[PDB]
Amino acid sequence: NNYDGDTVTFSPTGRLFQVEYALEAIKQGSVTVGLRSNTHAVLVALKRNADELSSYQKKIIKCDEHMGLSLAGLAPDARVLSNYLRQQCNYSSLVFNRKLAVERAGHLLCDKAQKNTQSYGGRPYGVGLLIIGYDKSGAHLLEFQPSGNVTELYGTAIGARSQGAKTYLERTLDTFIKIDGNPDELIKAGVEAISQSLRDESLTVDNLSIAIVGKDTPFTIYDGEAVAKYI
Amino acid sequence: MTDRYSFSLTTFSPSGKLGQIDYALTAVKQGVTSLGIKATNGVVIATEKKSSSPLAMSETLSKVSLLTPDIGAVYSGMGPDYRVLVDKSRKVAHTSYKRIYGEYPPTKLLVSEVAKIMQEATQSGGVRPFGVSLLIAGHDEFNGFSLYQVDPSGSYFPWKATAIGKGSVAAKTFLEKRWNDELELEDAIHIALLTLKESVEGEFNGDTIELAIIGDENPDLLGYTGIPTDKGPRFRKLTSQEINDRLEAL
Amino acid sequence: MDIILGIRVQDSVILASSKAVTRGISVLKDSDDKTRQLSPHTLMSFAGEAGDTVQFAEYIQANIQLYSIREDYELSPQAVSSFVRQELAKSIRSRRPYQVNVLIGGYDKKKNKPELYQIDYLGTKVELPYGAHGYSGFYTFSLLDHHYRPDMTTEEGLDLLKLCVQELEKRMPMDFKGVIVKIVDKDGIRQVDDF
Amino acid sequence: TGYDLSNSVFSPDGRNFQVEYAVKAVENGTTSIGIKCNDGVVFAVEKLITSKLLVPQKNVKIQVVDRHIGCVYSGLIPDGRHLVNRGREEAASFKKLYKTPIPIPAFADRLGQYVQAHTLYNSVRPFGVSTIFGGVDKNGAHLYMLEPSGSYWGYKGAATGKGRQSAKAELEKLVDHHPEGLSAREAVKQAAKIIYLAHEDNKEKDFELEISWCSLSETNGLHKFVKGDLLQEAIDFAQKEIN
Amino acid sequence: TTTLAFRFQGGIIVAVDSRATAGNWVASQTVKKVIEINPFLLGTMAGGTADCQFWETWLGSQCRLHELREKERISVAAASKILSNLVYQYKGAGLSMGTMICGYTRKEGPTIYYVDSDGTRLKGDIFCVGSGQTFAYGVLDSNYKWDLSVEDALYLGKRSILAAAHRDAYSGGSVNLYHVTEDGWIYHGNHDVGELFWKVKEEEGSFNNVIG
Amino acid sequence: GYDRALSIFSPDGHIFQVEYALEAVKRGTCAVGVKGKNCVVLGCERRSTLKLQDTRITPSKVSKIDSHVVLSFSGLNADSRILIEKARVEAQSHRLTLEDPVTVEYLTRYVAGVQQRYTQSGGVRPFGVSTLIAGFDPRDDEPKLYQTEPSGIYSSWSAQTIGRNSKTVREFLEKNYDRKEPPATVEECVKLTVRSLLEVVQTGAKNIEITVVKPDSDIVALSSEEINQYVTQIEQEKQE
Amino acid sequence: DRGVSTFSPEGRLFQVEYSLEAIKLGSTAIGIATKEGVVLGVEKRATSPLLESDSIEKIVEIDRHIGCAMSGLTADARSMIEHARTAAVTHNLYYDEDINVESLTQSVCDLALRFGELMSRPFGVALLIAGHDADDGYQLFHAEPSGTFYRYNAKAIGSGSEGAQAELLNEWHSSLTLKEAELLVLKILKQVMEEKLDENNAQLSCITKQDGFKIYDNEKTAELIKELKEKEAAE
Amino acid sequence: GSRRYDSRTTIFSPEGRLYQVEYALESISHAGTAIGIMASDGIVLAAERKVTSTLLEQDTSTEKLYKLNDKIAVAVAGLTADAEILINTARIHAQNYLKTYNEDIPVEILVRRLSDIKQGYTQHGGLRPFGVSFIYAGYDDRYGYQLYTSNPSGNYTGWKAISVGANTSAAQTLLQMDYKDDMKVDDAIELALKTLSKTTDSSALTYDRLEFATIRKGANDGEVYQKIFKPQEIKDILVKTGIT
Numbered sequence A: 001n002n003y004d005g006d007t008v009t010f011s012p013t014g015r016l017f018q019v020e021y022a023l024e025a026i027k028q029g030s031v032t033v034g035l036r037s038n039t040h041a042v043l044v045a046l047k048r049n050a051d052e053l054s055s056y057q058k059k060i061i062k063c064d065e066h067m068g069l070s071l072a073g074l075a076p077d078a079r080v081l082s083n084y085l086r087q088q089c090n091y092s093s094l095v096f097n098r099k100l101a102v103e104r105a106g107h108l109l110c111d112k113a114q115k116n117t118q119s120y121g122g123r124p125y126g127v128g129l130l131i132i133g134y135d136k137s138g139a140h141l142l143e144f145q146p147s148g149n150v151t152e153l154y155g156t157a158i159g160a161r162s163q164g165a166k167t168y169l170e171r172t173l174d175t176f177i178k179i180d181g182n183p184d185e186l187i188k189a190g191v192e193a194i195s196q197s198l199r200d201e202s203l204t205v206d207n208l209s210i211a212i213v214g215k216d217t218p219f220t221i222y223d224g225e226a227v228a229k230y231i
Numbered sequence B: 001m002t003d004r005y006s007f008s009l010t011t012f013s014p015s016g017k018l019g020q021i022d023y024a025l026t027a028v029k030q031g032v033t034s035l036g037i038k039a040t041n042g043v044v045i046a047t048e049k050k051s052s053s054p055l056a057m058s059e060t061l062s063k064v065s066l067l068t069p070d071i072g073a074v075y076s077g078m079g080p081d082y083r084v085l086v087d088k089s090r091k092v093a094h095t096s097y098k099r100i101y102g103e104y105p106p107t108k109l110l111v112s113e114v115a116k117i118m119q120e121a122t123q124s125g126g127v128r129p130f131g132v133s134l135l136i137a138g139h140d141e142f143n144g145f146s147l148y149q150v151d152p153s154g155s156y157f158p159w160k161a162t163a164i165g166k167g168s169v170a171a172k173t174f175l176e177k178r179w180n181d182e183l184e185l186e187d188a189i190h191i192a193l194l195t196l197k198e199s200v201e202g203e204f205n206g207d208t209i210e211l212a213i214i215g216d217e218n219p220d221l222l223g224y225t226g227i228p229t230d231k232g233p234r235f236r237k238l239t240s241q242e243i244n245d246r247l248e249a250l
Numbered sequence C: 001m002d003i004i005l006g007i008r009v010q011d012s013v014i015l016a017s018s019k020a021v022t023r024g025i026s027v028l029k030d031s032d033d034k035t036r037q038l039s040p041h042t043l044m045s046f047a048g049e050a051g052d053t054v055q056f057a058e059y060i061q062a063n064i065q066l067y068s069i070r071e072d073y074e075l076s077p078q079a080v081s082s083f084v085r086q087e088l089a090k091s092i093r094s095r096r097p098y099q100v101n102v103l104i105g106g107y108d109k110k111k112n113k114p115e116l117y118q119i120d121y122l123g124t125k126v127e128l129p130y131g132a133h134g135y136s137g138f139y140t141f142s143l144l145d146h147h148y149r150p151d152m153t154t155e156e157g158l159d160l161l162k163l164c165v166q167e168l169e170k171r172m173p174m175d176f177k178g179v180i181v182k183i184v185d186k187d188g189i190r191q192v193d194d195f
Numbered sequence D: 001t002g003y004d005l006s007n008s009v010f011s012p013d014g015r016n017f018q019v020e021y022a023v024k025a026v027e028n029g030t031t032s033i034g035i036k037c038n039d040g041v042v043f044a045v046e047k048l049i050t051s052k053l054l055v056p057q058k059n060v061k062i063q064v065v066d067r068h069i070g071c072v073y074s075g076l077i078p079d080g081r082h083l084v085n086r087g088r089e090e091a092a093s094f095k096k097l098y099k100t101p102i103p104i105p106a107f108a109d110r111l112g113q114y115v116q117a118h119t120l121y122n123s124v125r126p127f128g129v130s131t132i133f134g135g136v137d138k139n140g141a142h143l144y145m146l147e148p149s150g151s152y153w154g155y156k157g158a159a160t161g162k163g164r165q166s167a168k169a170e171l172e173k174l175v176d177h178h179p180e181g182l183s184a185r186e187a188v189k190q191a192a193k194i195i196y197l198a199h200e201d202n203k204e205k206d207f208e209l210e211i212s213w214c215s216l217s218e219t220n221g222l223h224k225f226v227k228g229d230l231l232q233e234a235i236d237f238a239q240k241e242i243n
Numbered sequence E: 001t002t003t004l005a006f007r008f009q010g011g012i013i014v015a016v017d018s019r020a021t022a023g024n025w026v027a028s029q030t031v032k033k034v035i036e037i038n039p040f041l042l043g044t045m046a047g048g049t050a051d052c053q054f055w056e057t058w059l060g061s062q063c064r065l066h067e068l069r070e071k072e073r074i075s076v077a078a079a080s081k082i083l084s085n086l087v088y089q090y091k092g093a094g095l096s097m098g099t100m101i102c103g104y105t106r107k108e109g110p111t112i113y114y115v116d117s118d119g120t121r122l123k124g125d126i127f128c129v130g131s132g133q134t135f136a137y138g139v140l141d142s143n144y145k146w147d148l149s150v151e152d153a154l155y156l157g158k159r160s161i162l163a164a165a166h167r168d169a170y171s172g173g174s175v176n177l178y179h180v181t182e183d184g185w186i187y188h189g190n191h192d193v194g195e196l197f198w199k200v201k202e203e204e205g206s207f208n209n210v211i212g
Numbered sequence F: 001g002y003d004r005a006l007s008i009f010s011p012d013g014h015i016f017q018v019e020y021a022l023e024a025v026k027r028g029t030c031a032v033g034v035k036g037k038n039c040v041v042l043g044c045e046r047r048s049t050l051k052l053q054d055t056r057i058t059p060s061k062v063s064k065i066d067s068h069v070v071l072s073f074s075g076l077n078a079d080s081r082i083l084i085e086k087a088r089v090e091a092q093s094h095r096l097t098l099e100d101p102v103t104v105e106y107l108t109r110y111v112a113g114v115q116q117r118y119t120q121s122g123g124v125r126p127f128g129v130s131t132l133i134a135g136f137d138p139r140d141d142e143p144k145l146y147q148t149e150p151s152g153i154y155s156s157w158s159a160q161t162i163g164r165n166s167k168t169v170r171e172f173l174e175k176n177y178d179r180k181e182p183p184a185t186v187e188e189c190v191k192l193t194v195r196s197l198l199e200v201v202q203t204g205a206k207n208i209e210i211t212v213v214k215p216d217s218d219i220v221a222l223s224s225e226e227i228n229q230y231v232t233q234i235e236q237e238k239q240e
Numbered sequence G: 001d002r003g004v005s006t007f008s009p010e011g012r013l014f015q016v017e018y019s020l021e022a023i024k025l026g027s028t029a030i031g032i033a034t035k036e037g038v039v040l041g042v043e044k045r046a047t048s049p050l051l052e053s054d055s056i057e058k059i060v061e062i063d064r065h066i067g068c069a070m071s072g073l074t075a076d077a078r079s080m081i082e083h084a085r086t087a088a089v090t091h092n093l094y095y096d097e098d099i100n101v102e103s104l105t106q107s108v109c110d111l112a113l114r115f116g117e118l119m120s121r122p123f124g125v126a127l128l129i130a131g132h133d134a135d136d137g138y139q140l141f142h143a144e145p146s147g148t149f150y151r152y153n154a155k156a157i158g159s160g161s162e163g164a165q166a167e168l169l170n171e172w173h174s175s176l177t178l179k180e181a182e183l184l185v186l187k188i189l190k191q192v193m194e195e196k197l198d199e200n201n202a203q204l205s206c207i208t209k210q211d212g213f214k215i216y217d218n219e220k221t222a223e224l225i226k227e228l229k230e231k232e233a234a235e
Numbered sequence H: 001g002s003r004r005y006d007s008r009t010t011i012f013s014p015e016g017r018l019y020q021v022e023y024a025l026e027s028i029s030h031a032g033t034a035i036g037i038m039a040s041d042g043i044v045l046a047a048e049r050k051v052t053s054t055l056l057e058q059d060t061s062t063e064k065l066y067k068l069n070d071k072i073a074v075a076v077a078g079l080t081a082d083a084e085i086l087i088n089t090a091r092i093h094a095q096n097y098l099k100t101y102n103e104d105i106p107v108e109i110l111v112r113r114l115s116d117i118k119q120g121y122t123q124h125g126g127l128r129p130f131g132v133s134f135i136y137a138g139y140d141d142r143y144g145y146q147l148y149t150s151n152p153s154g155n156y157t158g159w160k161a162i163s164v165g166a167n168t169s170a171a172q173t174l175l176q177m178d179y180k181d182d183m184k185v186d187d188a189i190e191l192a193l194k195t196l197s198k199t200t201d202s203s204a205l206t207y208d209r210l211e212f213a214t215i216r217k218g219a220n221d222g223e224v225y226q227k228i229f230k231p232q233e234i235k236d237i238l239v240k241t242g243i244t
């Protein structure tokens, strides 16, 4: 109310309203889902268009050969944060000949987002990210929030109506976690997960976006006719 | 972080007033009375030593300060503001004059430099004006004895005699009746003590009054001998005993 | 670069400047004009380090032209020479100084007098009846000491100048491919085409 | 009024309301504690299991500074991480210049001054965390608790978060019942009990227990996480006491 | 290197050799020393290969930006001055370049500018640049007339490079010919000195110093 | 440094500081530009609440940017000096690097760019000035007249006016200027310019300035008597 | 007042949303993409009849293979075009090739959010970027001051956009010829424009692989206007 | 942050006026009146000191009239402290010009630069403008005798006779009434003093409440002399014209 003019101001109950308004931008964003087994990690994203004449806003970005994310909210802010991840993954390779641990990737994003919430002039990032990766400790899935809070999960979902997929994955937990050495089945589980967040619209060929990374699979994105298999 | 106040805190109001300068002058009005009187062979500056507590040692707090060997300053208003101004005034006398010309600045020019510093606090980003009015008394070879008043705006005016602060209005009237262009330094000191007694309420002695003069050179206060041209400081702070001597023949 | 001369007579300043541009064992050009018009009644010739010469001349030219447009007024030759000297006086204590020597020939319209200024790359300015830069002076100064008179006409000045060029063509080691001559007077700047 | 809209502004009381508002964010957070023992310190924190989908043991909240200091905090988690990152920089530069690892009181003032600095200007926000930290140095064991204002003291036992009053009451009993001292292995078990008791103030979601410890004899003066058999032993001890 | 370009009745001829050296080591015999900036502008390269190649390609990018911004092809004078002002900024740093900016525009007509790495910029009708410039000058000057035909001017340019290629140890390879007209530049082929010398010797009757 | 974003969007999509700068222009004295078949004429109003002026030394309303281009303006006088100075410096800089004087379009584009920069830079306010820039491109005889404004937009005009009561004189020019047949001579062009100012000015005494620019750096300012003859001639034809 | 980079309670940046209102006030610009080329057309909208309309430059070349149309505060576009041209030419210098139309658009869109307390406010202009490259063929992009760009088969921006976009929705198909697209832009521009459409107050342009980006003459557009009127009367 | 306390000194009103400039002019209208009058053989500067006290040292005082160089002087109306900042800049600028061109600075050039500095404070920087209006009186060999005025906006104009500070409206009407072009210095001296005497807010115009200066070619042959009048000289000139 009087305490939402900038990020540097606490409310009387100890809330940061600018950070909460940034969180709101994610809720308006199109749904995206993340889930993993012990061998693979999968992103599934519902893309959104302006109208029937327009393209479908790309939701998934590759960060390295072993890491990448999906976005929900302000896309330019995802571009800034993904670019930062690309550099941090790259620094780790050039300097240490070491693939950046997905956990460190989360810690780095947390600290970058935090600095924008404590200084005058700046603003919080207006996007939520789901980072998947395969590193020296197996498959991983992270959930980034622009408050700075990063969280490691077996599965999750962010965006509009993400609660449907998040409930489904919470039920399916014991099934999909043991889909080891089978990419197409882990994707099927993710495609079924995101289907719980659909209203009036269904998954078409230029609407669905799927990404996968795993033990013997580089981070690769599937669009267009390559996702027709899963509809 | 960093000073984000890069904009003026003193600005013109619709009526044309500079609010902060006016309010600074109001702070000066609240301040304790100080005065200055110019004689033919000297200048006297005087003020009341308002003690904050009887446990406080008022000797450790100097309201009258030496700026150069021939220039002295006194004030009315906010003490801390005055203290830093004296530090800056002493330094500028060296950096922008003595280190260039090998001699101390004349009174008018040192006054000019202090005025500049106070003017900048009126226009620069993220600062308030100084809450003091200064009275600067001094001597130099080509201008003789002089007495100046410097206000929070940065304006300065030369005076034959004047007073600033609490009871300045009454004190100025008193000085108008007594001042003539034939006053000797001792006559000016006498009038200064008379004028100050009107504004002072409690004790009136050498321990509650601070008083300095700009007069003859003091070879005994120089600290060394051998250079004929160097003859000693014209600024001298009257001792607590020296004041009481003059308070008997008052 | 190499040869630049200047002679101030009764009513004009005459500048002569060599036409050769040599680099190594090749004369690359024999029609080079080593001068810039700074203002309608002010001309500057220049000699020195390759690149520096033209870069400096044009930089001064731009500044004087800028002044002229700003004030709708022509700076006096004395004022222009002082500006040029100061630029060189700055330059000599830079990281890379301009190695350029100049002569400034001008007609002061307020005084109705011709004026010649000699300024070296250090920023050493002198007003002279006749001036030269480089090795040329070693021949021309003594020659002009003898033959020059302060009340000469422009025609007499040109004949006096022919005498200098002839002496240089006789005793100088290098072929400087003749000179371009220009006259600065009350009517401005004009070039002598047959010299 | 409007005295609470800007950081570093004194109210007519002489208070910085923005700092007091940051304290509210801390009170909202999960419970964390510290227990000073014979030859070291023990830290423990409550991790609310929001969902089944959270990977157990894989959202670590206790952080190490240098090799001998442990930090835990309640409130805005990112703010805590920023403070530890600074703590690590401060500890590194101390070791760089002076060779010896940073003493705990020295380290406490480094964080204290940094947090205090964020109450001096309106262009920054105060920290939304109370940090409990400590370790073992040349002078033995030290436990500290730092607050948004920059205020810190040494502690026998410390607690912050939503269950701070429950935890404080439990801590005060240990101090009274053990005047000679508590052993490191005992403190680990007690820490588990107190987190389980302090969980009553946050009992909608069930939680995951996390413990760490520095001890001159048990961990050789270095910070280590309590895992496996020692953790399950501490969990069982706590489970037995609530029933 | 030996590069030349001269102005005449029918426009501009530009001719260059194709050798690159590193001391006495012949590094290449097939180097391109003419860079085509646009359909109406050419740049010749002599001196440091990287210096020339890098900054003249860069010059081409600046000329493109000019015509995008000004909706008009850049003048030869302005194009040459971009390059000369650039190298003047690096004066003393050790760049090594002897270049010629040749081209046609409506306002200028056929124009040639000499630009080198110590900041010299000269407009002129004839220039020869490179270690073999003097050898090219000798033949070019002694056969040059303004009224040369396009056929004769092309040959003279070719023959002048051949002269230098032969005598100068650091020139050779092949001759690249260009002709610049009001309609733009026209490429007139790569001519290997290996065959061209003997062909010229036989047909022309020159090069009697050589064992036939 | 002072960083404040002074020019910002409002809810309706307006930049008020830019729009309030246009109000300053509307307060300024009227300026008019009319281009003929072989010339451009810049006319300027001078307010007559100032008697005891010294017209020798008082800044003229029309400024030479180079020998071939001129700039007149409406709005804040102090602001215009900054634009004129920058334009004059760019004029010399262009001659130095391109070896050719600026085109009137280029010089206008530069001045307009400067004005635009001051609408999305922190710590500055927009220029309270609109300009009329007139002249002839090097080696060209086609007249050029351009207009700029605080927002940074610029465009070419057959004839245009800016300043106070400019809407009245624009109305006059819109019916009195034929695109198919522009003022064929200098006299015709000056007269149409003076006529248009007389709709707004007051007395045709020391209130009107006229500057005529012709091809190849041929710029001259008319004196009082010369202008007064146009004023005298127009009034006698009017009484009909 | 309030921060320039402040979020609204709905999770949108105030300044970005306000700049979008400025763009709605701008003159109409329309782009249509075909397999034979991309057509760009704009409404000139002269504020007065004395203003020489050919000096109104709302269609602009970025490179030989990329063209651009604008709408809104058009003065704000100058530095965006300058950047785009430099980005295009610089990439050609670094890689000896034409830069992809999408990469160009992304580079321009990177400027967009570089405002705050960098420039003082967002751009008040939207751009239609049309071009061709070997990889993705003929493309049309809509670049906004939010930093977001969408690829479009057809798109209208400006005051008559929502009416024109609804018209483009019906008319566009994947087999349009270039000539069909030209007429379609003229048709839809004539509908949404205030004043009557002619060669002086509307401008056409196209980009083809063969001939690159070309702004049409007033004579060429006039004939397409005459061809359009005749075809609408013919049924 | 600090945005809360920013007055925004360099913005437009909805009417297109600069608030701070308008308020600075309002401030200046309460300062002591200063008058400049340009004659054919010299210039007169006359200014009224702000309500004087009898104990003020009058001879060693400078408040209104300042010397910029040997050929140019200024009369001040507004904040003195602000004026001295600008005067020192103007003094330095004159010496820079002399150092560069070896010629004394033309009056307008000096006036333009000082006015450009004022302009800057109204467009950028977020600082308050200088609350000062100058009357410049000077000579150069291009335009001869010149009078200019500049104000907080940074706008300057040339004059034959002009007043700044208090009661300018009444003062300007009186000057406009009695001024004529063939006027001499001694006539201008009388006009200046007569105008102040009628527009003054004081009871009677006396020597101790005035500063006076002339710039004549009344030296010896083709050179200009600045005369800043001493107290006794003002007393005499006031008697000579019959005001006291």
Ligand SMILES: *[C@@](C)(CO)[C@](*)(O)[C@H](Cc1ccccc1)NC(=O)[C@H](Cc1ccc(OC)cc1)NC(=O)[C@H](C)NC(=O)CN1CCOCC1
Pocket: E001, E002, E019, E020, E021, E022, E027, E031, E032, E033, E045, E046, E047, E048, E049, E050, E052, E053, E096, E130, E131, E170, E171
């Ligand atoms: C003839 C053959 C004489 O060299 C030409 O000038 C020729 C010009 C040329 C231009 C473009 C493309 C090919 C050829 N120049 C060279 O071939 C040149 C000679 C040269 C060597 C060193 C120089 O620095 C003083 C200047 C000129 N050869 C090279 O540049 C060779 C290929 N590379 C190097 O010598 C590498 N050096 C360059 C300078 O920095 C250190 C490494």
